[PDB]
Design a protein around this ligand. Structure first.
Ligand SMILES: [Ca+2]
Ligand SMILES: [Ca+2]
Ligand SMILES: [Ca+2]
Ligand SMILES: [Ca+2]
Lengths: 132, 131
């Protein structure tokens, strides 16, 4: 499931970025072999996420948009609570697949909480100082 | 990640029962005792424990940090409003993919809400503003 999610998220991004998604671009972006991509694409095709360049069905597009959103939100989350920027991508890449929608939605409210009043960010930063 | 789950599980069993048997480990992790004997031999080789099953100081320190990590992540999701029943499965999944930096920052976040209940109330307000 996680792997399928990484493929769909990547395909969505490529289509939005280049207008198309090639097996070759998919393979490179995911650091995998084209044989693994072809196999995965056939599975996604079977499950109706896309059609074998390759075009996403409405189902793959809705899921892709959501996966990209999930990624972006999780990066903002760690960024806001002060995680070293260089560590953020790798952590989001691992946890993004293991968070229920309830957790994603709650994390979304947390981000909004800190975004609607900068004093709150200042208050959270102060705690980091005490901890130090 | 699997090694971390075994170490975390072994530390808890020893802390609760006073010892950790292969059968208790397999039962707690829902796996075959063969898979446990394999992992244990591996943890023994890496010096986290000695093949009853006794943790080395290395395994104890790691074991304790892992249990702390688990507890912390549950408190974090609990505090932001995640349905209690979904918390365990999510933590079990993300615990292995968070850097210590993120863990430490999540630690401050939890401290942030715990030191002033008024902040928890403002967070709840926003959750109700969602529309
Ligand atoms: Ca990923
Ligand atoms: Ca991602
Ligand atoms: Ca786990
Ligand atoms: Ca755990």
């Amino acid at each position: 499931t996680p792997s399928m999610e990484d493929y769909i998220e990547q395909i969505y991004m490529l289509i939005e970025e280049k207008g198309y998604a090639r097996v070759s671009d998919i393979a490179e972006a995911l650091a995998v072999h084209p044989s693994s991509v072809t196999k995965m694409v056939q599975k996604l095709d079977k499950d109706e996420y896309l059609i074998y360049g390759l075009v996403l069905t409405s189902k793959g597009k809705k899921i892709g948009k959501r996966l990209v959103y999930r990624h972006e939100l999780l990066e903002q989350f760690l960024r806001i609570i002060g995680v070293d920027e260089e560590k953020i991508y790798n952590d989001v890449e691992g946890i993004e697949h293991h968070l229920s929608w309830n957790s994603i939605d709650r994390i979304g409210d947390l981000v909004q909480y800190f975004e609607e009043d900068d004093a709150r960010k200042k208050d959270l930063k102060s705690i980091q100082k005490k901890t130090e």
